[PDB]
């Protein structure tokens, strides 16, 4: 049933090549660059493996169906295995994004490891293997579940409805909530730090203008409390407090000037740590946004088709969905570009590997 009228097959092969190339560069950058050895970038590498296996195993079979007028050319029991691999890789992807969002949030609230990251990644893959499992279990026993007019697709309306809910809308919702609370957490952490900075800076000025021990002691006690809210400084403040208690006003004032170097060092370090987390959250927010928006047409159209079953042209719906599948496959090529545009470490690593300089 081969059709030679397929300029679409040129555009799909581009999407396969951008997907495989981009994701190998992500996989090599997390493998080789120490500056990317962290839990977030381990999940982004697992995401890249899911994208790479879509480009090798799922996307070329999808191109093969376009060439034969969406008439399944492979043996008939490979249809349910193809859909299984297709739904598993993308389900693993949305639970990866949702695992990154939740991990970052929990990491702020619990301020206190490769193995912990690999436990979570492996848990996300097992969760996606088990939830996607009804597709081959029922679809290999009943062709009517994975075939409509000799097209291979998920043909049971109930798998599409229940599947979209448990594998798209629920983890999207968890992703959206945990991302929003992460942005509020980080704004509050930046805000509490600035408040602590004002209290420390103002008290240092009081100690500087002090003529009496009581003023220095009151200011240093207030400084100690602020330091606890944000240690090495707390001990240094206690030494300055001891001088003030024994009436050594001048000596305590000098010790307070010594505190300034410790205060400035910590403030700048914790303050540039928080703006690193905020920038990281923004890039993840582009990844998150582009994964949902690119898959939204396919899911919403497919839910509209179930709702207006009798009333709507299923031939036009099936044509649009075929297009909409490829907007979703194009997302497999976007994550590496996003990292090039907004992460210098990824841009630098990609630049060397393309030049085949694999040495650190
Ligand atoms: C008309 N028609 C075209 C062919 N196509 C098709 C399917 C079902 C019904 C109708 C179909 C199949 C779906 N496949 C994409 C699955 C996306 C997914 O599982 C997922 C999970 C979680 C996510 F967060 C985001 C995406 C593309 C290939 C098949
Ligand atoms: C499948 C293949 C295609 C390209 C491959 C990668 C190419 C190069 C490297 C760098 C090496 O240091 C570790 C393995 C790693 C990361 C490979 C892992 C497996 C891989 C992703
Ligand atoms: C079952 C198939 C489909 C996917 C299974 C996922 C496995 C193979 C993947 C997902 C995430 C991956 C890890 C992600 C991070 C790192 C650290 C890096 O410096 C070297 C590779 C290493 C150690 C990877 C090893 C393999 C890994 C655990
Ligand atoms: C995750 C949950 C949410 C919905 C669940 C499915 C809902 C209904 C059925 C049909 C039943 O006959 C076998 C289990 C099966 C296939 C469930 C498997 C586990 C499942 C996918
Ligand atoms: C929400 C955004 C991001 C994209 C989603 C697009 C969805 C909601 C819209 C866009 C165009 C729409 C289609 C336009 C016209 C027709 C022809 C009619 O006989 C059957 C329904 C059908 C096929 C519509 C179904 C819903 C549809 C697919
Ligand atoms: C985003 C980048 C991917 C671009 C396009 C892929 C779209 C593929 C669309 C293929 C056209 C449909 C077709 O040729 O098949 C219809 C056929 O008549 C039914 O039997
Ligand atoms: C994870 C679970 C899914 C994996 C394996 C299930 C069985 C795979 C079946 C593949 C059949 C391949 C084949 O050749 O099909 C025989 C027949 O000729 C076709 O019509
Ligand atoms: C909500 C569920 C998120 C994905 C499941 C999972 O295993 O997440 C690992 C861990 O919860 C992340 O810190
Ligand atoms: C095939 C075998 C694997 C499948 C089953 C594996 C399940 C492991 C789940 C979690 C590990 C991570 C927990 C350890 C990390 C400590 C930090 C912490 O507080 O995490 C708790 C949670 O993230 C906030 O509620
Ligand atoms: C949470 C992680 C795993 C979730 C679901 C696993 C089970 C998926 C469902 C697998 C099909 C169950 C089955 O074997 O059903 C037999 C049927 O009644 C006769 O064909
Ligand atoms: C005796 C045989 C009866 C067989 C059962 C018939 C009725 C059960 C309905 C749904 C099953 C579970 C579906 C949810 C999980 C599988 C689908 C999935 O993961 O999602 C697909 C994808 O997300 C969508 O585009
Ligand atoms: C629609 C999908 C939204 C994906 C999350 C990315 C984003 O920017 O959302 C902001 C959030 O809704 C508010 O904090
Ligand atoms: C291949 C598609 C285009 C890839 C171009 C990515 C490189 C790029 O645009 O990086 C410069 C940018 O101004 C960030 O510094
Ligand atoms: C499609 C994106 C594929 C990933 C883009 C990888 C090529 C970008 C690159 O390596 O550019 C380095 C340079 O420093 C930039 O200004
Ligand atoms: Mg003030």
Swiss-Prot record:
Q: Which residues lie on this side of the membrane: Cytoplasmic?
A: 29-42, 103-116
Instruction: Find motif (NPxxY motif) and give its ranges.
Output: 335-339
Part of the whole protein covered = 70 to 401 of 471
Tell me the keywords, alphabetical order.
Behavior, Cell membrane, Cell projection, Cytoplasmic vesicle, Disulfide bond, G-protein coupled receptor, Glycoprotein, Host cell receptor for virus entry, Host-virus interaction, Membrane, Phosphoprotein, Receptor, Synapse, Transducer, Transmembrane, Transmembrane helix
- The transmembrane segments are 12-28, 43-68, 78-102, 117-140, 158-183, 282-307, 316-341
Print the miscellaneous field.
Answer: Binds lysergic acid diethylamine (LSD) in the orthosteric pocket. Bound LSD dissociates extremely slowly, with a residence time of about 221 minutes at 37 degrees Celsius.
Binding-site residues, serotonin: 86, 302
What molecular functions are annotated in GO for this chain?
1-(4-iodo-2,5-dimethoxyphenyl)propan-2-amine binding; G protein-coupled serotonin receptor activity; Gq/11-coupled serotonin receptor activity; identical protein binding; neurotransmitter receptor activity; protein tyrosine kinase activator activity; protein-containing complex binding; serotonin binding
Family per UniProt? Belongs to the G-protein coupled receptor 1 family.
Activity modulation notes? G-protein coupled receptor activity is regulated by lipids: oleamide increases HTR2A-mediated activity. Inhibited by IHCH-7179 small molecule: IHCH-7179 acts both as an agonist activator for HTR1A and as an antagonist inhibitor for HTR2A.
Role of this protein: G-protein coupled receptor for 5-hydroxytryptamine (serotonin). Also functions as a receptor for various drugs and psychoactive substances, including mescaline, psilocybin, 1-(2,5-dimethoxy-4-iodophenyl)-2-aminopropane (DOI) and lysergic acid diethylamide (LSD). Ligand binding causes a conformation change that triggers signaling via guanine nucleotide-binding proteins (G proteins) and modulates the activity of downstream effectors. (Microbial infection) Acts as a receptor for human JC polyomavirus/JCPyV.
Assembly and interaction partners: Interacts (via C-terminus) with MPDZ and PATJ. May interact (via C-terminus) with MPP3, PRDX6, DLG4, DLG1, CASK, APBA1 and MAGI2. Interacts with GRM2 and DRD2; this may affect signaling.
How changing residue 321 to A affects the protein? Decreased ability to bind serotonin and psilocybin
GO biological process, any:
positive regulation of neuron apoptotic process
What tissue specificity is annotated for this entry? Answer: Detected in brain cortex (at protein level). Detected in blood platelets.
The domain comment in this protein's record states: The PDZ domain-binding motif is involved in the interaction with PATJ, CASK, APBA1, DLG1 and DLG4.
User: Per the database entry, which stretches of residues form a coiled coil?
Assistant: none
- Lineage, uppermost ranks: Eukaryota, Metazoa, Chordata, Craniata, Vertebrata
Query: Any idea what this protein is called?
Result: 5-hydroxytryptamine receptor 2A
Cystine pairs annotated here are: 79-152, 308-312
Extracellular-side stretches of the chain, per the record, are 69-77, 141-157, 308-315
- Report the GO terms under cellular component: axon; caveola; cell body fiber; cytoplasmic vesicle; dendrite; dendritic shaft; G protein-coupled serotonin receptor complex; glutamatergic synapse
- Write out the annotated subcellular location: Cell membrane; Cell projection, Dendrite; Cell projection, Axon; Cytoplasmic vesicle
Site positions for Hydrophobic barrier that decreases the speed of ligand binding and dissociation: 154
What topology does it adopt in the membrane?
Answer: Multi-pass membrane protein
């Amino acid at each position: 049933h081969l059709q030679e009228k397929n300029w679409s097959a040129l555009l799909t092969a581009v999407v396969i090549i951008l997907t495989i190339a981009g994701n190998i560069l992500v996989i090599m950058a997390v493998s080789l660059e120490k500056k990317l050895q962290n839990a977030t970038n381990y999940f982004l590498m697992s995401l890249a493996i899911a994208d790479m296996l879509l480009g090798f195993l799922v996307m070329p079979v999808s191109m093969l169906t376009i060439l034969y007028g969406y008439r399944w050319p492979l043996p008939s029991k490979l249809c349910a295995v193809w859909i299984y691999l297709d739904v598993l890789f993308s389900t693993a992807k949305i639970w990866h994004l949702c695992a990154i969002s939740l991990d970052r949030y929990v990491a702020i609230q619990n301020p206190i490891s490769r193995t912990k990251a690999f436990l979570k990644i492996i848990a996300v893959w097992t969760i996606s293997v088990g939830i996607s499992m009804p597709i081959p279990v029922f679809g290999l026993q009943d062709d009517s579940k994975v075939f409509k007019e000799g097209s291979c697709l998920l043909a049971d309306d109930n798998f599409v409805l229940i599947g979209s809910f448990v594998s798209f809308f629920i983890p999207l919702t968890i992703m959206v909530i945990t991302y929003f609370l992460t942005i509020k957490s980080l704004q509050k952490e930046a805000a509490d730090l600035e408040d602590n900075w004002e209290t420390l800076n103002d008290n240092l000025k009081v100690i500087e203008k002090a003529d009496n021990a009581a003023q220095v002691k009151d200011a240093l006690t207030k400084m100690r409390a602020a330091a606890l809210d944000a240690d090495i400084l707390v001990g240094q403040i206690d030494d300055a407090l001891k001088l003030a208690n024994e009436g050594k006003v001048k000596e305590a004032q000098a010790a307070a000037e010594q505190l300034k170097t410790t205060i400035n060092a910590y403030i700048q370090k914790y303050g540039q740590s928080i703006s690193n987390e905020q920038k990281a959250c923004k890039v993840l927010g582009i990844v998150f946004f582009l994964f949902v928006v690119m898959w939204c047409p396919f899911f919403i159209t497919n839910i509209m088709a179930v709702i207006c079953k009798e009333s709507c042209n299923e031939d036009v719906i099936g044509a649009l969905l075929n297009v909409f599948v490829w907007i979703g496959y194009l997302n497999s090529a976007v994550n590496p570009l996003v990292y090039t545009l907004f992460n210098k470490t990824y841009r630098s690593a990609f630049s060397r590997y393309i030049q085949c300089q694999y040495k650190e």
